[model samples]
Target: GSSGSSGKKAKKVRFYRNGDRYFKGIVYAISPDRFRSFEALLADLTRTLSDNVNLPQGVRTIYTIDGLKKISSLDQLVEGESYVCGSIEPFKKLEYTKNVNPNWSVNVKTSGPSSG
Candidate 1:
């Protein structure tokens, strides 16, 4: 019999917050073999953080927003493991826009695709 061996795997998710927003995060401090299943961990982490229960020390949700994007497929990821996701803020420029910082820019990244 030549059957695959299944082993226990761990998952770790990283969170980040920027000035009035976030720039997405990476997750690789866990089991690489469990990358596919790791998406469930990512969802759980986000839900836990959003729920404000059993939270990590000095960690709290500052704002309420919908889930923006997610990168979970191993094919799209740089490595064949882990999942990445974050919020997406839409930007709009009015014809008479003003009082906005001209040097401001939005940065977005994914763990599966990006290093950080």
Candidate 2:
């Protein structure tokens, strides 16, 4: 599928770790054509979270945070919204505050920065 990407917006998607403690703040602008795959996004998270083998907790469920619907695949990752999940059951609803910069992750922005 050599479909040219001429008009796909790079959206800011917020990711919050599950409520098994908490790890908040992280936004990424993954263009529609840049989704190498689901695991690529997963790897982004896994890499940022630190720790390797103990990642079993992050392998369970996936649901659209705001829509409250199950996300069967990466294609369901709607733009400009929060995706709350983490290393337990895969879909743990974490706490999110109303203080996030939309354009921070030129690629990947961590929790600690000019943000809360």
Candidate 3:
């Protein structure tokens, strides 16, 4: 048998509303390629959640669980990750803004040591 992994695997998304940690009922397995564009994904998401979770009428926003960054494009989505969606958009973090702090500054400064 040949191992034929779908070129574009379905992205498992855990969606939550403005309040609460998360509602398991809103989770969905979506195919990114099926939407192709960011707008398409959002529109599809809205439609899928119409019966499960109600949202304010108008444009919606999707963000990572921490609300650090918004998933503006389908390409930004990672597999099996959680997300938060709401009517108002979250504060967007710039692409250059790094959340991690580099711990290695000098890599243990050698005191009175000769170069090898």
Candidate 4:
């Protein structure tokens, strides 16, 4: 019979934000046998941070950086990885205008500063 554990030591990982100092984010000790996809890890992170911050909704999307490079997708991550995660900025309201042109047709226009 084969068991999940093969007697290897577990790997440790930690998460951080830009302004985080000595104490912040979550640390994980995970075994290879218990390894899951990066998306799963992200979901857990969102839940944890949201709970800690007492927010109505958990973090929806996050920007992840591994060392100097950005992680564009979850598949780029690996087990036992330490990375920093930051929340996306909130969306801004757009300015809208409604008018009737000389042709007697209604026109609507919307423009606003980019949410960056």
Best by TM-score: 2
Clashing pairs in 4: none
Model 3 bad stretches (over 4 Å): 1-7, 50-54, 89-116
TM-score of 3: 0.55
| Total clashing pairs in model 3 | 0
Question: TM-score for every candidate vs. truth?
Answer: 0.26, 0.58, 0.55, 0.41
Report the Cα lDDT for residue 96, model 4: 13
The lDDT, on a scale of 0 to 1, for candidate 1 is 0.33
Question: In terms of lDDT, which candidate is stronger, 1 or 3?
Answer: 3
Put down candidate 1 lDDT per residue, 38-105, tens digits, no spaces: 45545555654433222323232222122233444423322212222233432222221122222212
The segments of candidate 2 whose C-alpha lies over 4 angstroms from its true place after superposition are: 1-7, 20-22, 50-60, 90-94, 98-116
Ranking by TM-score: 2, 3, 4, 1
User: Listing every candidate in turn, what is its Cα RMSD in Å to the true structure after a full C-alpha superposition?
Assistant: 12.8, 6.3, 15.0, 19.7
Say which prediction, candidate 1 or candidate 4, comes out ahead on lDDT: 4
CA lDDT of every candidate? 0.33, 0.57, 0.56, 0.46
Of 3 and 4, the candidate ranking higher by TM-score: 3
Give me the overall lDDT of model 2.
0.57
- Give the per-residue lDDT of model 2 (tens digit) for 64-89: 55536755567666566766644544
Lowest summed lDDT across 10 adjacent residues in model 3 is found at 95-104
Taking all chains together, the TM-score of candidate 4 against the true structure is: 0.41
